[PDB]
Write an enzyme that holds these catalytic residues in place. Structure first.
Site, short mmCIF file in Angstrom:
data_model
loop_
_atom_site.label_atom_id
_atom_site.label_comp_id
_atom_site.label_asym_id
_atom_site.label_seq_id
_atom_site.Cartn_x
_atom_site.Cartn_y
_atom_site.Cartn_z
N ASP A 20 0.80 -1.23 0.00
CA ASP A 20 0.00 0.00 0.00
C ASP A 20 0.83 1.28 0.00
O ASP A 20 0.55 2.22 0.74
CB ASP A 20 -0.95 0.01 1.21
CG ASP A 20 -2.04 1.08 1.10
OD1 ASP A 20 -2.20 1.67 0.01
OD2 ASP A 20 -2.74 1.31 2.11
N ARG B 51 0.05 9.38 0.40
CA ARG B 51 -0.73 9.52 1.62
C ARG B 51 -0.14 8.66 2.73
O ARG B 51 -0.39 8.89 3.91
CB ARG B 51 -2.18 9.11 1.38
CG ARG B 51 -2.33 7.64 1.01
CD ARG B 51 -3.79 7.20 0.89
NE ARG B 51 -3.83 5.84 0.36
CZ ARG B 51 -3.88 5.57 -0.94
NH1 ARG B 51 -3.91 6.55 -1.82
NH2 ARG B 51 -3.85 4.31 -1.35
N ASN B 52 0.65 7.65 2.34
CA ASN B 52 1.14 6.68 3.31
C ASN B 52 2.63 6.84 3.63
O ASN B 52 3.26 5.93 4.16
CB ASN B 52 0.84 5.27 2.82
CG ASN B 52 -0.63 4.92 2.94
OD1 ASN B 52 -1.37 5.57 3.69
ND2 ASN B 52 -1.07 3.90 2.21
N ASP C 63 2.36 3.49 7.03
CA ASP C 63 1.20 2.64 6.81
C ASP C 63 1.57 1.20 6.47
O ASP C 63 1.17 0.68 5.42
CB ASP C 63 0.32 3.21 5.69
CG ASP C 63 -1.05 2.55 5.64
OD1 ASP C 63 -1.41 1.84 6.61
OD2 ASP C 63 -1.78 2.74 4.65
F1 LIG Z 1 -4.59 12.78 6.71
C1 LIG Z 1 -3.79 11.72 6.95
C2 LIG Z 1 -3.25 10.99 5.87
C3 LIG Z 1 -2.41 9.89 6.12
C4 LIG Z 1 -2.11 9.51 7.46
C5 LIG Z 1 -1.22 8.35 7.76
C6 LIG Z 1 -0.61 7.56 6.73
N1 LIG Z 1 0.18 6.53 7.03
C7 LIG Z 1 0.43 6.20 8.32
N2 LIG Z 1 1.15 5.26 8.91
N3 LIG Z 1 1.04 5.38 10.19
C8 LIG Z 1 0.26 6.38 10.50
C9 LIG Z 1 -0.11 6.84 11.91
C10 LIG Z 1 0.47 8.20 12.26
C11 LIG Z 1 1.78 8.29 12.80
C12 LIG Z 1 2.34 9.52 13.14
C13 LIG Z 1 1.58 10.72 12.97
N4 LIG Z 1 2.10 11.94 13.30
C14 LIG Z 1 1.40 13.07 13.15
C15 LIG Z 1 0.08 13.06 12.61
C16 LIG Z 1 -0.51 11.85 12.25
C17 LIG Z 1 0.24 10.64 12.42
C18 LIG Z 1 -0.31 9.35 12.08
N5 LIG Z 1 -0.15 6.94 9.34
N6 LIG Z 1 -0.99 8.03 9.02
C19 LIG Z 1 -2.67 10.25 8.54
C20 LIG Z 1 -3.50 11.35 8.28
#
Ligand SMILES: Fc1ccc(-c2cnc3nnc(Cc4ccc5ncccc5c4)n3n2)cc1
Length: 282
Positions: A142, A146-147, A160
């Site tokens: 994936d 976005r990831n 992700d």
């Molecule tokens: F609008 C969106 C678009 C994509 C994500 C996304 C994508 N892949 C990820 N892999 N792990 C995480 C968690 C994760 C880990 C650290 C973070 N730090 C700050 C803000 C959000 C977070 C989220 N994420 N999150 C989050 C918000």
């Protein structure tokens, strides 16, 4: 399962060591939301909830699949801070906080206005993280803008995957594929849509799409191709068009990533070389 328990115990975080701000959502996934948290000497972190997964079997399967994440270590791969088990509720997945959020929202932000050089630099970073994951024989399944996340030093983290895996933007996942499950069909390699098999070479296909997202500053791929038609569109040999500000040699890289024959597509190691050369001419 006692084996899964031994692995988890290597990274367990006691509830007393973790403060979670459940009024501060910074991410939304299918298995749960992401929250501002603090880990203890206070470290600012991101706490991913798995609470939507209530069945113990499925919680076990998710942990089993994602735990290897603790064995990875690379500057362009998102690391696991730990797992907080408590008396009521699904395990909390604790991750490093990413000051600049996901790469897609970052490059789309109009005050940012990242240059062609900035964007190619970001792609070089992803190529390097993916190169490390492939060397561990880990298949991502994936990869997309976005990831990937961006920390306070503007280091890109391939994200992700493993314990952080979820669908963080639902609009780009569709049930219109052979599995019937929600999948990112517009990032998927043709043979994956046909055979439902994912490899490192199909990751390379996805990386190509991510490159395209970069050069368009976060434009959605194939906006005119319905999810019903994605497979036939690729069968006819059609592909994403060259972004206005994409350098010709980089578009050549995207095309190689989408070669219909998986074996004919570059490796991430090769991509690091080619993109590194392209980046250096800037
Ligand atoms: F609008 C969106 C678009 C994509 C994500 C996304 C994508 N892949 C990820 N892999 N792990 C995480 C968690 C994760 C880990 C650290 C973070 N730090 C700050 C803000 C959000 C977070 C989220 N994420 N999150 C989050 C918000």
């Amino acid at each position: 399962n006692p084996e899964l328990v031994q692995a988890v115990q290597h990274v367990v975080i006691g509830p007393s060591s973790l403060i979670v701000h459940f009024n501060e959502v910074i991410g939304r996934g299918h298995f749960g939301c992401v929250y501002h948290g603090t880990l203890l000497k206070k470290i600012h972190c991101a706490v991913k909830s798995l609470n939507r997964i209530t069945d113990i079997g499925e919680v076990s399967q998710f942990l089993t699949e994602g735990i290897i994440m603790k064995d990875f270590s690379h500057p362009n791969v998102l690391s696991l801070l730990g797992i907080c088990l408590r008396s009521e509720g699904s395990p909390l997945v604790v991750l490093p906080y990413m000051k600049h959020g996901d790469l897609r929202n970052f490059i789309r932000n109009e005050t940012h206005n990242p240059t062609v050089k900035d964007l190619i630099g970001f792609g070089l970073q992803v190529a390097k993280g993916m190169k490390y994951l492939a060397s561990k024989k880990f298949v991502h399944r994936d990869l997309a803008a976005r990831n990937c996340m961006l920390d306070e030093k503007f280091t890109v983290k391939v994200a992700d995957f493993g314990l952080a895996r979820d669908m963080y933007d639902k609009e780009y996942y569709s049930v219109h594929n052979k599995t019937g499950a929600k999948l990112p069909v517009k990032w998927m390699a043709l043979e994956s849509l046909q055979t439902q098999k994912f490899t490192t070479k199909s990751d390379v296909w996805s990386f190509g799409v991510l490159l395209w997202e970069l050069m368009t500053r976060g434009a959605p791929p194939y906006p005119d191709v319905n999810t019903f038609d994605i497979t036939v569109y690729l069968l006819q040999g059609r592909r994403l068009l060259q972004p206005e500000y994409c350098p010709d040699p980089l578009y050549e890289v995207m095309l190689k990533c989408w070669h219909p024959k998986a074996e004919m597509r570059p490796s991430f190691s090769e991509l690091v070389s080619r993109i590194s050369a392209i980046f250096s001419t800037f």
